[PDB]
Design a protein around this ligand. Sequence first.
Ligand code: HEM
Length: 291
Amino acid sequence: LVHVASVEKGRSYEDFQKVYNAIALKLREDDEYDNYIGYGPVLVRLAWHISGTWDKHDNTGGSYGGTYRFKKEFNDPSNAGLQNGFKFLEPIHKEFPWISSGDLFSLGGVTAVQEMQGPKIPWRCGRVDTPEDTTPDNGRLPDADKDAGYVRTFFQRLNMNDREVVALKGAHALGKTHLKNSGYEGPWGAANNVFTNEFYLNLLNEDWKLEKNDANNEQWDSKSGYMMLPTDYSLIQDPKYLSIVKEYANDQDKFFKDFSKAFEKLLENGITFPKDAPSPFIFKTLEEQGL
Ligand code: HEM
């Protein structure tokens, strides 16, 4: 498979900035979701899950085709709870019907991070909706009950190396696990709708205790009311992941620079960009626009 990026006909930066502004104004307005965390965390999880089905060996899956819109991918057990982010973005797609699905799903992720005080993520347009038979089969997204060797091997399929994996995992400072969605319960930290290096500080500074939860799954719990998944706790069990966790705990700007590079790569995997194509767009926040 080759997937060539094709700009939506006649659209330039200013058009996409209007779709960004619409997603950001609605994030601001629907602040009450999930006990006032808001929709920013489930929108960066949606952008990672439509991207995380990619396989580097045959170029199948990934954000290009916007195939989450189809029943098979939408109803994947690993995607439980993402229907809330889909329902958020659906009025925005009625307002701007020209944008492709993959481009809307991935721009929701970008808008969420930037509006939650995260780094600027460069974004490229050009995903094209592909037919229902290109929808990847279920089971390509990662398990949480596993160790650091699983994590490394999994992320190799998306060709992410160690630095990219630890930077990307730092998005778990956002939101929380929900027992009904995944069999796990609790937040990773206290400021869970502001993007910071808090995941790494909690992982190095809390007194974590291994316990089973109400779904019979193991998780690491701390006195503070926070939790860590087995795959998260893995990052301090592996010697190579642990030196990077410490680096991000001591330097949030290095974490923001690397998270930015890796999250753009993850959203662009599987897509060929012609050099006639526009450069990646940097969108202004509502705040930079006085809106
Ligand atoms: C081995 C890797 C990963 C595993 C096993 C994993 C697993 C999980 C699980 C079990 C949840 C909770 C789902 C729920 O109950 O609602 C979750 C939530 C979340 N994940 Fe991950 N994750 C991984 C990687 C990532 C990456 C790479 C990103 C983003 C760049 C990410 C972003 C999020 C966010 C922001 C949430 C919170 C969603 C919400 O609050 O509703 N995750 N993850």
